[PDB]
Structures are given as C-alpha cells and as structure tokens.
C-alpha cells in the first residue's frame, strides 16, 4: 500500500550504506523501491547513507545497473549535515531537544524505567551552549549528546527521548553527527521522498514525530519484510573472515550472497524479481526453480562427457570419415539458431551409461539415431570398449554422446558449489571448507561460440553458466542449481 499515491508524483529512494557490497537482502529493497516508482510513473533516488563515520560506491552502482535499476539522481546523507545542524538548533529553541551528559548504561536504565533525565529541563541557552561544545569537539562536548524531548513515559521506547546528535572525535570536517533516526525523516522530507520504504523490524511513530515537530512536508513509510536465506552468512565480519583466511579467494565468490556472486552463480535478475513478487530465512529451492523455468526455454543445449571415465563406443559399420549435420541449439526454440554436429565411427559415452548395456540391445544416441550394441570389452574388471552397429534410420535408453575427435573436443572444468556453512543460522566450527567440487569434461566443439556469462544446458547433466575462458581454449563453467 502506497498511501495517497499519485501517478507522476511518487518519489522513492534506495539508501544503501557505502560500507560494503550489495547482497540479495539489499536487492529486495532496491527492487521494491523501483517497483513502486514504476507503478506510479515516478522517480527513484539513490542515496548513499553515510550518516556515521566509518569506496564501495562503484560496486553498488555496477550492481544496480546489473539489476536493471535506474535512478534519477545520486545523493549522500552527508550532503545535508549543515541543514541537520540547523534543524537541531531549531529543535533546541522550540524546547524540543536538550543536551544530555548522562552516561550510556545509566541512560539505558533511566529510559527503561521511564524516568526523565536531569538535563531534560535545561534552558534553551544552556542546551545551545552545550551543542556548541559538541560542535567544537571539546571534552565537554564529547561528554554530551543532543536528545529529542518527546515523552519519557510513552509505551513506545522509540518515543522516550531518542538521541539526535552525537559527538564523534575519533574516526575520520564535522565533530558531531546526527543519528540515523534523526537524519532519516529530515533528509527524506528535504529530498522530496513521498514514500520511504524500509524493513518491518517501531520507529514509524518517532519518524513522524520528527517530521511534524519541525513542520516539514509529510513522508509516508511503507514497511516490507527483510529477505534473508538459510545457510547464508551475511554478517560482513564473517565474510571478511572467509576472504582473509583463503576460504574463498574473492568477494565475488559464487558461494557469497553478494549480488555479484549470485549472478556469477547463474541467477537471472528476472528470477529474483519474480521470487520477490511471489514470496525468517527463506529457502533457495523456490528461487532456483523460478530461475530454471525462466532460462530453460531460451538457452542452448550442448553435450559433455566426463573426460576420464568416458568409454569408447565404436560403430563398426561406419568409416572414420567425419560427417557433419546442422542441428538446432534448442529443439523447441528455432530462434536460438543452429549448431554443427560431427560424427564418425568412434564415440565417447558416460561410464554411468556404458555399464548399463548388454549384447544385442537397441538404444538411441540423442540427436543422431539408434544403434544396436553387440559386445562389451572389459579388461581388469572395468569396461574398456563398447562395440555396436549403426541403425540411424521403440527405445527407452536415449543417451548423450560426443564424437571421439580429441583435437576438436573442448575441455572444460565444471564447478559445483554448496553452501559455505552447514547450519541455517565459534561459528567457524560449521564451515564446509570443501564446497567447491570440480570435474573435468569434454564438450561439443560448437560450445566455443559461447561468450562469458552465457547460460546453457548440458544434456542429461543440468544447467551451467560460462564463467571464464582459459588459455589453450579451456572453459570454466559453474553449475546453476535447478531447484530439484
Ligand atoms: Cl513484504
Ligand atoms: Cl551472519
Ligand atoms: Cl574465484
Ligand atoms: Co508505465
Ligand atoms: Co565512500
Ligand atoms: Co577525547
Ligand atoms: Co540446499
Ligand atoms: Co544413413
Ligand atoms: Co560438497
Ligand atoms: Co583452469
Ligand atoms: Co584449464
């Protein structure tokens, strides 16, 4: 619900902290801000929330582009600190704010037991004196913070004189800083936000109090539920730990809930958006199934066999001459176009498939035709070769295959990931330090027409995305989870 939303006069804002990389939680917020702006033909601001002192701007911008989210203007919270100071003084002069030098623990306990602080009835002139000390960074100032003067006996703790301005001397222009709670309603009013979105985890009463106490233009708050996932570390400290200890070797690792990582993992922005519109810690299965049903009809198909367990199949009635036929990259989608298929008398099949055969049995080699198995050569116990006869011109065993043309077979590594932690929510006890499985395969020559980040399907094998191309023509392909 966008309260009193008017077509052409809605302004939302996405306000991420430039203190890290966007993760998928951020994605629900950035998407919903764009979704309500577009619904009402409005505007979406990008605001870097730099309220408290701590260059990720570039990464955030690039993720927001990757998600296809455009914004009308970029701002910083710090852009308005002068204005916030002015309002804080106005607050003091309406006796709506006071300087308090009570310590942290005793202030929490006073707030709990609803007892008004000693300084709550400081004069205006004294409050202004002490705020000036806060502004100049003196030890007096560092002892003081400005609180709003609301209602210490209110049933809602956020209305019990919340802190507005704090003195911060230590960490890197300004010696006092507004709090998030004070900065956020004022900046939203002055930037022209009409509908401010945020997580439902209330501060709504206090935010409204700040706006009306200062007679600013009203701003509506819409709450949404935070999106977080099982078995997913999103604490920035622990992500740092992963990187620093060489568990992953970068912040874009496909096991990281970061936006870059997940796209690298194979997720479409469409799948994420659709999951959000259709949707505590959520389960990944619904998201990857939505992704699969989005990408399956519009990606090519290719074949691959295990490079070393594959068995040599020989059609003994054919010659070594290489026949090549055109085929469709997608059997039920002619737009994706054609590839070239190559065949000979010699083929590669999976040992999984080879050890299921027996003499005088008909099977199909997919996209080629049926063959009749005649014998199985086994040396040392394991299957050495399969001899069959061509019958290309009834069967339940349709298997994939590759031509045994080693100088054209493209060599690939398949990376299959699992979750970095093992429980859903000393934590390092539950790290799967072994969540990156590699398998080497041969694939079809035509797969060389694929470019980086192209998505595709390996027949009877699953879904993959081309992450990188190696020297001497080797591909690195990430398996995309499919839900089932
Ligand atoms: Cl929601
Ligand atoms: Cl965490
Ligand atoms: Cl990597
Ligand atoms: Co429209
Ligand atoms: Co910065
Ligand atoms: Co000091
Ligand atoms: Co799982
Ligand atoms: Co023929
Ligand atoms: Co594993
Ligand atoms: Co490599
Ligand atoms: Co390689």
Among 409, 434, 450, residue at a domain's last position:
409
Ion ligand 9 residues within 5 Å by Cβ: 418
3-state secondary structure (DSSP) of residue 439? strand
Q: How far is the CA of 416 from the centre of ligand 9 (A)?
A: 8
**Do 235 and 100 fall into the same domain?**
no
393 marked among binding-site residues: yes
330 marked among binding-site residues: no
Nearest ligand to the CA of 288 is 7
User: In angstroms, rounded to a whole number, what is the distance separating the alpha carbons of residues 25 and 43?
Assistant: 22
Q: Per DSSP, what are the bridge partners of residue 48?
A: 76
Q: How far is the CA of 250 from the centre of ligand 11 (A)?
A: 19
**Do 50 and 71 fall into the same domain?**
yes
Nearest ligand to the CA of 436 is 9
Distances from the Cα of 76 to the Cα of 48, 89, 132, 199, 333, angstroms: 5, 22, 24, 20, 47
**Do 193 and 216 fall into the same domain?**
yes
Q: How many structural domains compose the chain? A: 5
226 is catalytic: yes
296 marked among binding-site residues: no
**Do 368 and 379 fall into the same domain?**
yes
Within-domain flag for 1: no
Which residue pairs from 350-359 have beta carbons closer than 8 angstroms and sit at least 24 positions apart in sequence? 350/305, 350/306, 350/309, 350/310, 350/311, 350/399, 350/400, 351/306, 351/309, 351/310, 351/311, 351/383, 352/309, 353/399, 354/311, 354/313, 354/383, 354/386, 355/383, 356/397, 357/386, 357/397
26 marked among binding-site residues: yes
Q: How far is the CA of 284 from the centre of ligand 7 (A)?
A: 7
Q: How far is the CA of 375 from the centre of ligand 7 (A)?
A: 41
H/E element, 132:
helix 124-136
**Do 432 and 403 fall into the same domain?**
no
418 marked among binding-site residues: yes
Cα angle 285-237-419, degrees, rounded to a multiple of 5 = 25
Q: How far is the CA of 242 from the centre of ligand 9 (A)?
A: 17
191 marked among binding-site residues: no
Within-domain flag for 100: yes
**Do 217 and 231 fall into the same domain?**
no
Q: How far is the CA of 6 from the centre of ligand 9 (A)?
A: 51
H/E element, 478:
strand 475-480
Within-domain flag for 4: no
DSSP, res 243: H
437 marked among binding-site residues: yes
User: In angstroms, rounded to a whole number, what is the distance separating the alpha carbons of residues 245 and 249?
Assistant: 9
Within-domain flag for 2: no
**Do 49 and 99 fall into the same domain?**
no
Give burial (CB, 10 Å; 0-12/13-18/19+) of 145: buried
**Do 99 and 109 fall into the same domain?**
yes
User: What resolution (Å)?
Assistant: 2.3
**Do 110 and 121 fall into the same domain?**
yes
DSSP, res 366: T
3-state secondary structure (DSSP) of residue 324? strand
Nearest ligand to the CA of 286 is 7
Half-sphere exposure of residue 395: CA atoms within 13 angstroms, side-chain side = 17
Within-domain flag for 405: yes
236 is catalytic: yes
Q: How far is the CA of 342 from the centre of ligand 8 (A)?
A: 14
Half-sphere exposure of residue 89: CA atoms within 13 angstroms, side-chain side = 12
How many other β-carbons are positioned within 10 Å of the β-carbon of residue 90? 14
Within-domain flag for 211: yes
17 is catalytic: yes
Within-domain flag for 3: no
- Tokens linked to 467: 């992450």
Burial 271-309 (b: 16+ CB within 10 A, else e): bbbbbbeeeeebebeebbbbbbebbbeebbbbbbbbbee
Domain that holds residue 126: 78-177
Residues in the chain: 484
Query: From the candidates 70, 108, 217, 226, which is the catalytic residue?
Result: 226
**Do 85 and 52 fall into the same domain?**
no
**Do 311 and 405 fall into the same domain?**
yes
**Do 350 and 375 fall into the same domain?**
yes
Give yes or no for a contact between 345 and 318, defined as CB atoms under 8 angstroms apart. Answer: yes
Within-domain flag for 321: yes
- The gap from C-alpha 407 to its chain's centroid, in whole angstroms, comes to 39
Method: X-ray
Among 298, 316, 331, residue at a domain's last position:
298
Among 391, 409, 427, residue at a domain's last position:
409
Query: From the candidates 70, 73, 93, 236, which is the catalytic residue?
Result: 236
């Amino acid at each position: 619900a966008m309260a009193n939303a008017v077509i052409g006069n809605v302004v939302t804002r996405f306000p991420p902290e430039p203190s890290g990389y966007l993760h998928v939680g951020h994605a629900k917020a950035a998407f919903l801000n764009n979704y309500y702006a577009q619904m009402y033909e409005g505007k979406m601001l990008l605001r870097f929330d730099d309220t408290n002192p701590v260059k990720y701007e570039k990464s955030i911008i690039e993720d927001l582009e990757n998600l296809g989210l455009k914004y009308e203007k970029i701002s910083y919270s710090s852009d308005h600190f002068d204005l916030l100071e002015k309002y804080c003084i106005d607050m003091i002069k309406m006796n709506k704010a006071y300087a308090d030098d009570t310590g942290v623990e005793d202030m929490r306990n006073q707030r709990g037991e609803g007892i008004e602080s000693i300084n709550r009835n400081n004069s205006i002139e004294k409050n202004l004196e002490l705020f000036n000390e806060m502004r100049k960074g003196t030890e007096i100032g560092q002892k003081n913070c400005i609180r709003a003067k609301i209602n210490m006996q209110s049933k809602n703790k956020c209305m019990r004189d919340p802190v507005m301005y704090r003195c911060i001397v230590d960490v890197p222009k300004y010696k006092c800083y507004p709090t998030y709670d004070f900065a956020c309603p004022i900046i939203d009013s002055i930037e022209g936000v009409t509908h401010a979105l945020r997580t439902n985890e209330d501060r709504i009463e206090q935010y409204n109090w700040f706006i009306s106490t200062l007679n600013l233009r009203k701003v509506y708050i819409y709450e949404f539920s935070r999106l977080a996932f099982v078995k997913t570390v999103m604490s920035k400290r622990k992500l740092k730990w992963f990187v620093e200890n060489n568990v992953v070797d970068s912040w874009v690792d496909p096991r990281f809930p970061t936006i870059k990582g997940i796209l690298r993992r194979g997720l479409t922005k469409e799948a994420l958006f659709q999951f959000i519109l259709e949707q505590n810690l959520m389960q990944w299965d619904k998201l990857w199934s939505i992704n699969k049903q989005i990408i399956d009809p519009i990606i090519p198909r290719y074949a691959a066999v295990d490079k070393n367990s594959s068995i040599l199949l020989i059609l003994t009635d054919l010659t070594d001459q290489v026949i090549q036929k055109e085929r469709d990259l997608h059997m039920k989608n002619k737009s994706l176009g054609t590839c070239n298929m190559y065949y000979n008398n010699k083929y590669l099949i999976e040992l999984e498939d080879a050890q299921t055969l027996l003499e005088n049995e008909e099977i199909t080699l997919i996209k080629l035709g049926n063959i009749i198995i005649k014998n199985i050569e086994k040396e040392n116990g394991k299957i050495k070769q399969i001899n069959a006869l061509s019958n290309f011109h009834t069967t339940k065993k349709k298997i994939h295959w590759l031509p045994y043309l080693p100088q054209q077979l493209i060599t690939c590594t398949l990376y299959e990931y699992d979750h970095l932690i093992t429980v859903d929510k000393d934590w390092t006890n539950f790290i799967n330090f072994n969540s990156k499985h590699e398998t080497l395969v041969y694939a079809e020559p035509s797969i060389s027409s694929l470019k980086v980040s192209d998505k595709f399907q390996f027949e009877r094998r699953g879904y993959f995305i081309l992450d990188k191309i190696d020297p001497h023509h080797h591909l690195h392909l990430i398996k995309i989870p499919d839900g089932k």
